[PDB]
Design an enzyme around this catalytic site. Structure first.
Site, short mmCIF file in Angstrom:
data_model
loop_
_atom_site.label_atom_id
_atom_site.label_comp_id
_atom_site.label_asym_id
_atom_site.label_seq_id
_atom_site.Cartn_x
_atom_site.Cartn_y
_atom_site.Cartn_z
CB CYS B 65 -0.97 0.02 1.19
SG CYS B 65 -1.99 1.50 1.22
NE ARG B 68 2.42 0.62 3.58
CZ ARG B 68 3.58 0.00 3.78
NH1 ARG B 68 3.85 -0.57 4.95
NH2 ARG B 68 4.48 -0.03 2.80
CD1 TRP B 237 -7.18 8.84 -2.25
CD2 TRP B 237 -8.20 9.28 -0.29
NE1 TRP B 237 -6.23 9.35 -1.38
CE2 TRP B 237 -6.83 9.62 -0.18
CE3 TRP B 237 -9.04 9.46 0.82
CZ2 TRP B 237 -6.29 10.14 1.00
CZ3 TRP B 237 -8.50 9.98 1.98
CH2 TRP B 237 -7.14 10.32 2.07
CD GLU B 242 -5.72 1.97 -6.85
OE1 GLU B 242 -6.09 0.82 -6.52
OE2 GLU B 242 -5.90 2.98 -6.13
C1 HEM Z 1 -6.45 6.52 1.65
C2 HEM Z 1 -6.25 6.22 0.35
C3 HEM Z 1 -5.52 5.01 -0.13
C4 HEM Z 1 -4.83 4.93 -1.30
C5 HEM Z 1 -4.66 6.04 -2.30
C6 HEM Z 1 -4.29 3.61 -1.39
C7 HEM Z 1 -3.53 3.19 -2.48
C8 HEM Z 1 -3.30 1.84 -2.71
C9 HEM Z 1 -2.95 1.29 -3.97
C10 HEM Z 1 -2.75 2.05 -5.26
C11 HEM Z 1 -2.79 -0.05 -3.82
C12 HEM Z 1 -2.42 -1.02 -4.93
C13 HEM Z 1 -3.72 -1.69 -5.43
C14 HEM Z 1 -3.62 -2.34 -6.79
O1 HEM Z 1 -2.61 -2.20 -7.53
O2 HEM Z 1 -4.59 -3.02 -7.20
C15 HEM Z 1 -3.07 -0.34 -2.47
C16 HEM Z 1 -2.98 -1.61 -1.96
C17 HEM Z 1 -3.45 -1.87 -0.69
N1 HEM Z 1 -3.98 -1.01 0.20
FE1 HEM Z 1 -4.11 0.87 0.08
N2 HEM Z 1 -4.67 2.87 -0.33
C18 HEM Z 1 -5.40 3.66 0.50
C19 HEM Z 1 -6.01 3.31 1.71
C20 HEM Z 1 -5.99 2.04 2.27
C21 HEM Z 1 -6.74 1.62 3.38
C22 HEM Z 1 -7.71 2.50 4.13
C23 HEM Z 1 -6.41 0.28 3.63
C24 HEM Z 1 -6.94 -0.61 4.69
C25 HEM Z 1 -7.39 -0.18 5.89
C26 HEM Z 1 -5.46 -0.10 2.63
C27 HEM Z 1 -4.87 -1.34 2.50
C28 HEM Z 1 -4.29 -1.76 1.29
C29 HEM Z 1 -3.99 -3.18 1.05
C30 HEM Z 1 -4.20 -4.35 1.99
C31 HEM Z 1 -3.46 -3.26 -0.18
C32 HEM Z 1 -2.97 -4.50 -0.89
C33 HEM Z 1 -4.09 -5.45 -1.32
C34 HEM Z 1 -3.55 -6.67 -2.04
O3 HEM Z 1 -2.48 -7.22 -1.70
O4 HEM Z 1 -4.22 -7.13 -2.99
N3 HEM Z 1 -5.22 1.00 1.84
N4 HEM Z 1 -3.37 0.83 -1.78
N1 LIG Z 2 -5.63 -11.68 -5.90
C1 LIG Z 2 -6.68 -11.44 -5.24
N2 LIG Z 2 -7.22 -10.20 -5.18
C2 LIG Z 2 -6.82 -9.12 -5.92
C3 LIG Z 2 -6.65 -9.19 -7.30
C4 LIG Z 2 -6.26 -8.07 -8.03
C5 LIG Z 2 -6.03 -6.84 -7.39
C6 LIG Z 2 -6.21 -6.75 -6.02
C7 LIG Z 2 -5.96 -5.43 -5.31
C8 LIG Z 2 -7.23 -4.58 -5.22
C9 LIG Z 2 -6.95 -3.42 -4.28
C10 LIG Z 2 -6.49 -3.71 -3.00
C11 LIG Z 2 -6.22 -2.67 -2.11
C12 LIG Z 2 -6.39 -1.35 -2.51
C13 LIG Z 2 -6.86 -1.03 -3.79
N3 LIG Z 2 -7.02 0.27 -4.21
C14 LIG Z 2 -7.48 1.27 -3.44
N4 LIG Z 2 -7.22 2.51 -3.66
C15 LIG Z 2 -8.24 0.87 -2.24
C16 LIG Z 2 -9.28 -0.02 -1.98
C17 LIG Z 2 -9.57 -0.06 -0.62
C18 LIG Z 2 -8.78 0.74 0.22
S1 LIG Z 2 -7.64 1.57 -0.79
C19 LIG Z 2 -7.13 -2.09 -4.67
C20 LIG Z 2 -6.60 -7.89 -5.29
C21 LIG Z 2 -7.31 -12.59 -4.50
C22 LIG Z 2 -6.89 -13.86 -4.12
C23 LIG Z 2 -7.86 -14.59 -3.42
C24 LIG Z 2 -9.08 -13.94 -3.20
S2 LIG Z 2 -8.94 -12.37 -3.92
CL LIG Z 3 -10.18 -1.13 -8.58
#
Ligand code: HEM
Ligand SMILES: N=C(Nc1cccc(CCc2cccc(NC(=N)c3cccs3)c2)c1)c1cccs1
Ligand SMILES: [Cl-]
Ligand code: HEM
Ligand SMILES: N=C(Nc1cccc(CCc2cccc(NC(=N)c3cccs3)c2)c1)c1cccs1
Ligand SMILES: C[C@H](O)[C@H](O)[C@H]1CNc2nc(N)[nH]c(=O)c2N1
Ligand SMILES: C[C@H](O)[C@H](O)[C@H]1CNc2nc(N)[nH]c(=O)c2N1
Ligand SMILES: [Cl-]
Lengths: 362, 362
Positions: B65, B68, B237, B242
């Site tokens: 993320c 953060r 947001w 993305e």
């Molecule tokens: C406040 C604005 C936020 C922005 C701009 C942001 C931005 C991002 C982006 C760009 C990604 C990559 C996602 C992708 O490539 O599909 C990401 C991943 C992630 N974000 Fe954030 N994020 C935010 C808030 C949060 C919040 C509030 C949480 C949880 C409480 C969070 C937890 C995560 C997690 C767990 C991932 C990785 C998910 C995965 O491995 O698939 N983020 N974030």
């Molecule tokens: N590979 C998987 N999931 C998956 C696949 C492709 C992309 C993603 C990431 C989606 C993601 C995660 C966290 C943040 C974001 N983008 C945002 N800006 C936010 C979404 C929520 C808080 S921030 C998008 C997750 C899975 C395996 C098993 C069950 S789901």
């Molecule tokens: Cl998305």
């Protein structure tokens, strides 16, 4: 342990190399020969065929290289016979000329005598054979910052640059038994350069950018079956992004994005305007257009990734494990528009290969 | 081993959490309490303060993320009290509304009852609470391919989509003790959407692109001190890339680059024209411009990387080890124009954290 290391690597290399060359039958006897030669001499000497194929394998095993589809067409120049600095200098001059080939670049490597007992026969100081100098006095940056330390060492030794942004560094190398390196100015007739213009924005020429035609990496060690060729400069052609997205773009290199933004007529005030991204695109378009226009080989990152996919497919078909470094293979612009971004790669180190070695200056 | 795993994680979490909250003195007694509660009940219940801080820590520890910096401002909604599917549905509805906040998005998480003995109380099927359906009959692609399997399961259960490219999927979840999930159509008044226009290319509207305002990840497990909250949808947001560089750009998603190229008046014939790169830039400019114009929170990748640098600096100042996944932190366009690209990150997994879990369908 050292003789044992040599013998082990030699055993693994010769088997694999002869297998690829359909020479498996000759493996037993050649290894006998090597085993005795090591016993006597403390080392062994590759045949022309082993050396050539070894250099090719090393390129094929370079995890960070997107250009590996053409590994088998590497032009290997055997210069293990050189003894004098005149011979080294001329071999380097020759490399530039034959690699350049009037702009139709030939991937070439020149191989100098290997280390003896970790003792270098020839020690090359240049990062690339053709590179620009970099200066910093009184907070004025001139030229290529990445060349700052090497430029300072050169000027220590009597060389003086004109302090343009594009001074060609001299070749600089040391011979075994000399305490100091020698340096030779590069003949301008040898070095192709490309002025950077844009296909439709005439003002782009106001930036007065240029870059050299052929990147020739001259500071890496080639390792083949336990033999360490610390001096083996090699070259391909550029992928356009190396020049447009890094050399000319990075803050710690030429840092041209704000100037690009101005000549293409966009503001460089707001992150949300993506002016850096737009500047990157136009500059990279300019670089490709300029090289193709002058008839100097170059590849764009999309075509390069397409070629690399074929490399992957060819590796699978040949039954070879593929290795790669994801963080280096993705291009520095639009990486998600290439297939590379969307898969994973095993970053294991397989030999023969090219490796970093410590700089002799700094 | 399971009770022992729980007790070990609980020991590590409570110490660290109370330390951060200036509550180190209360550690001994609270752990006594927990130790006995586990002995009896087979588990333990977090206090409101532990749950809230745990959810915040989990975000801070999410290696992938870039957003953060704002971990401490996470709005934690405690819904461990829900028992009925009506209560779940309404809690989800409420999450959307309060997170959206008329466009001024609030990073929010809603926490449902945790797994008992690996037994889910509530099992959410949606990838995000708000997402578009995807269809494929007879080689016509409609909507979001990434939603294909989930859309097929929904239609299995009696839902029918209008088969526009932007059908909103219904919320779909299963309760403990039900063999099938329920599904509820999303109230349109709840879902903010943004039509994609370009700041200076009027024809861009001809593409009729739009995207939803708030991404709400609803399929990850939150783990805090050994307790497994399999259902804890969270939102921030969007970072503009993305949407513009992936959702709308990827070949296996909406695949819009050729259409973008056409409306911005460039050929999509030659790799060396970098038409994909140019299309990526204009589309990403459009996305940022459209969100800011409608008053829906969004961040561009440069600002986001600048914020992340502050996150790194803040981590060092607090004496916390920083962890990160380089391959996810770099943005999919101009990554070399951010500091992230030029450094390395330790990809160790630290808890609390968010983790993937298997999909209940497919
Ligand atoms: C406040 C604005 C936020 C922005 C701009 C942001 C931005 C991002 C982006 C760009 C990604 C990559 C996602 C992708 O490539 O599909 C990401 C991943 C992630 N974000 Fe954030 N994020 C935010 C808030 C949060 C919040 C509030 C949480 C949880 C409480 C969070 C937890 C995560 C997690 C767990 C991932 C990785 C998910 C995965 O491995 O698939 N983020 N974030
Ligand atoms: N590979 C998987 N999931 C998956 C696949 C492709 C992309 C993603 C990431 C989606 C993601 C995660 C966290 C943040 C974001 N983008 C945002 N800006 C936010 C979404 C929520 C808080 S921030 C998008 C997750 C899975 C395996 C098993 C069950 S789901
Ligand atoms: Cl998305
Ligand atoms: C034929 C055209 C070639 C192209 C377009 C090409 C492309 C590239 C590119 C873009 C890189 C990344 C460099 C960077 O980011 O700074 C690279 C790395 C590399 N290439 Fe190639 N390459 C080519 C030929 C060769 C040849 C002929 C060799 C050696 C025989 C070679 C060996 C390597 C090695 C060792 C690296 C990594 C160096 C390091 O780790 O610093 N390549 N290549
Ligand atoms: N297209 C090219 N690009 C290319 C290929 C390989 C390497 C490079 C330069 C990579 C690079 C960048 C920054 C630093 C270094 N070297 C080091 N980090 C060192 C560590 C110790 C001594 S040098 C190498 C560029 C080619 C040149 C020669 C054949 S292909
Ligand atoms: C295989 C590869 O690592 C994979 O495509 C990753 C690359 N980095 C990424 N980075 C982000 N932010 N999002 C992604 O979905 C991916 N995909
Ligand atoms: C620290 C980081 O891995 C480093 O900046 C790498 C990233 N990937 C790269 N990729 C290429 N092709 N060239 C480089 O110089 C770098 N630098
Ligand atoms: Cl270079």
């Amino acid at each position: 342990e050292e003789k044992e290391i040599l013998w082990n690597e030699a055993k693994a290399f010769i088997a694999a190399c002869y297998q690829e060359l359909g020479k498996a039958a000759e493996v037993k006897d050649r290894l006998a020969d090597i085993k005795s030669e090591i016993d006597l001499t403390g080392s062994y000497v590759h045949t022309k065929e082993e050396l050539e194929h070894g250099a090719k394998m090393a390129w094929r095993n370079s995890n960070r290289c997107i250009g590996r589809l053409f590994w088998n067409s590497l032009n290997v120049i055997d210069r293990r016979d050189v003894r004098t600095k005149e011979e080294v200098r001329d071999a380097l001059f020759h490399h530039i000329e034959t690699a350049t080939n009037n702009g139709k670049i030939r991937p070439t490597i020149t191989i100098f005598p290997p280390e003896e007992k970790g003792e270098k026969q020839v020690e090359i100081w240049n990062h690339q054979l053709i590179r620009y100098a970099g200066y910093e006095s009184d907070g004025e940056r001139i030229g290529d910052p990445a060349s700052c330390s090497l430029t300072a060492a050169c000027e220590e030794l009597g060389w003086r640059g004109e302090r343009t942004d594009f001074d060609l560094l001299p070749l600089i190398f040391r011979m075994k038994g000399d305490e100091q390196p020698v340096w030779y100015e590069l003949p301008r007739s040898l070095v192709i350069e490309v002025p950077i213009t844009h296909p439709d924005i005439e003002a782009f020429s106001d930036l007065e950018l240029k870059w050299y035609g052929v990147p020739i990496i001259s500071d890496m060690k080639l390792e083949v079956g336990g033999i360490h060729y610390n001096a083996a400069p090699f070259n391909g052609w550029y992928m356009g992004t190396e020049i447009g997205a890094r050399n000319l773009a990075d803050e710690k290199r030429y840092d041209k994005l704000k100037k690009v933004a101005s000549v293409i007529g966009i503001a460089a005030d707001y992150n949300t305007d993506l002016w850096k991204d737009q500047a990157l695109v136009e500059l990279n378009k300019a670089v490709l257009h300029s090289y193709k226009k002058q008839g100097v080989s170059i590849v764009d990152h999309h075509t390069a990734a397409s070629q690399f996919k074929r490399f992957e497919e060819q590796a699978e078909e040949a039954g070879r494990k593929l290795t790669g470094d994801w963080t280096w293979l993705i291009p520095p612009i639009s990486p998600a528009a290439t297939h590379i971004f969307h898969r994973s790669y095993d970053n294991s180190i397989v030999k023969p290969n090219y490796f970093y070695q410590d700089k002799p200056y700094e």
